[PDB]
């Protein structure tokens with residue numbers, strides 16, 4: 233009777249490299265380019281805000297919508313090409329083990345909700361997850377607690393009995409702010425010290441290790 237709230241990019245789905253590459257493809261389509269470090273700094277964060285920051289324009293600039301739509305096309309094609317291969321090894325099996333032990337599972341992603349659901353459907357996450365929320369599901373996205381509180385409500389589990397698993401500082405900040413335990417993972421966008429400094433209770437180095445941490449309590 234406990235909840236596990238999982239980030240998508242860099243936690244369940246091995247997408248950081250594809251996100252960086254497709255971001256670059258989209259900027260090239262828009263006739264431009266930015267530093268590698270700038271792109272890397274955005275990986276896994278909300279997409280329109282990230283693209284606006286890389287282009288150096290207001291988020292409401294029409295160039296942002298153009299870039300976001302092009303990104304959606306390219307990323308959607310990538311996800312259809314990958315299917316379940318989009319996920320890190322052990323993810324579906326791990327989620328099944330958590331379900332078997334009586335945990336209710338949710339996704340909380342900085343992707344928009346429609347994209348999150350489509351990815352869940354193409355990878356097989358959909359049959360494991362009770363609730364899916366994205367950046368547009370709530371007024372205040374990561375690092376605010378709201379998304380985690382919203383999915384906890386969806387699960388019917390009080391925040392106190394939920395754990396957040398993610399690879400980003402925003403996930404750790406979201407979980408801590410929501411009054412939840414946080415398991416950071418080091419195989420995504422963040423190193424372990426940064427996650428500990430952001431409030432992770434522990435940091436593990438693989439998804440199966442995160443599952444073991446939850447199962448053993």
Ligand SMILES: [Mg+2]
Nearest residue numbers: 239241242276
């Ligand atoms: Mg992430």
